[PDB]
Ligand SMILES: O=C(O)C(=O)CS(=O)(=O)O
């Protein structure tokens with residue numbers, strides 16, 4: 001077979017055999033094993049510069065940073081091309097796209113046969129979770145994209161140290177990726193190779209992941225969504241733990257007590273902002289620290305507590321909207337050593353995106369930019385056509401250790417105990433600012449039934465309300481109704497210890513007024529809601545019983561430093577009977593679709609809410 005160039009530190013016979021089999025199938029010109037060093041990163045970045053995929057940014061303005069721009073067909077996740085190919089269709093469920101595995105294997109084999117002709121196969125070894133810790137799991141991604149290799153170096157623990165952990169017999173998650181654009185001898189490549197035809201396929205029984213045609217984000221960085229959510233949710237369902245689309249933060253009040261909170265918001269609905277929240281005026285003595293902004297692996301312990309870890313090593317965050325008001329910790333994080341994707345280029349070799357003008361003199365747009373499609377951009381063009389200099393799904397990739405607010409336990413494999421869960425969709429109407437569930441079952445209900453308006457994080461029409469249970473609609477690895485039962489069963493195990501269960505909240509930062517603008521100021525002001533949750537955790541916070549749960553009164557929040565009247569508070573906390581009667585009918589349609597294995601407790605909770613609305 002082809003010379004694999006297998007390094008001497010690879011002692012795993014089964015792994016080498018697997019690579020040999022994949023090289024026989026994909027037929028790359030050469031094979032390169034990524035060792036994960038900083039020196040290699042710089043070499044691969046310089047290689048990307050030569051290919052035109054990367055532009056190096058001005059070293060004086062943005063040290064050791066690069067900008068990539070993608071093909072306009074390859075800018076986001078493609079949910080319609082993402083499949084869970086379980087042996088039985090009922091174990092994919094109605095929220096997933098399924099195909100008989102042998103039938104998908106016959107569909108993909110011609111696509112991957114020779115997919116890497118004219119290209120290099122990069123072997124990308126990685127650990128999700130701290131290296132060699134009891135909770136970590138190892139993957140190997142074979143890819144023909146050097147863009148994948150360098151982004152994986154930031155987002156995971158990548159490289160030769162993985163093989164010390166694997167040893168001769170360790171198991172691993174097998175991942176194969178190709179941009180699906182094989183090159184003929186002497187053929188000129190493009191700056192962003194991709195294919196109009198795309199598949200992102202998961203075989204849960206074998207833990208296999210196959211990705212074809214996209215080089216972008218969660219389609220191609222296979223440790224992040226494919227492994228650490230879709231495959232990991234199957235593993236945790238069988239082994240007693242959870243893999244969740246949740247940030248994890250720590251918060252310390254002036255008396256020095258520290259709590260931790262996990263929040264599930266859908267894609268591009270404020271996780272990165274909340275996980276790095278800076279307390280505003282009126283909260284002297286409070287501090288917020290980040291454990292993670294996207295993925296949480298959680299399991300119960302004998303002491304009755306729920307322990308969470310962040311399995312990633314960096315941030316892959318939405319760029320537009322980031323500035324010193326909305327997320328200063330993130331602004332400081334991306335001062336250097338960052339990869340930017342699909343943002344705009346300034347005349348001085350820096351980057352720009354919509355929202356940055358809030359920090360500019362006169363809050364004014366730049367005079368001239370090159371947009372993410374390479375076209376000239378000016379404020380006049382933006383005024384007359386609304387052209388976006390940065391694509392709405394543009395991204396920064398940056399190490400977690402760049403974050404000034406990073407928690408000291410961010411990479412502690414013992415985890416942090418979770419004192420409260422938060423669920424929240426992007427809802428222009430109906431859902432109030434914050435509600436505490438009356439019981440664990442009612443909390444699971446609120447998580448199961450949450451809705452959210454679609455965003456640019458996946459292709460398709462943005463701004464449409466859809467059901468997104470637990471913010472896991474694009475990421476649940478098995479039948480969504482069985483997952484609801486898993487959460488119910490987890491609560492029973494915790495309660496049997498005698499412990500008090502974590503509280504569950506529903507939030508909504510995104511109610512709109514008649515002009516389409518947000519009625520709640522949000523961002524740093526979200527601390528005022530978080531501090532009520534802390535009060536409630538301590539047993540010191542008051543609240544009123546409403547239809548959907550317990551909500552604070554105006555006098556229960558701290559308004560020092562914010563001019564927000566009791567009338568504006570009533571607007572974002574009033575439970576509107578008609579809006580909720582309509583909302584509960586949309587829950588019934590969900591329950592009809594998820595009828596198979598749907599826990600009876602959800603129907604019972606719905607009937608109790610229906611009674612409270614008709615009272
Ligand atoms: O869309 C999301 O939820 C993300 O975190 C971005 S991606 O990794 O899916 O590209």
Ligand SMILES: [Mn+2]
Pocket residue numbers: 245267294
């Ligand atoms: Mn995400």
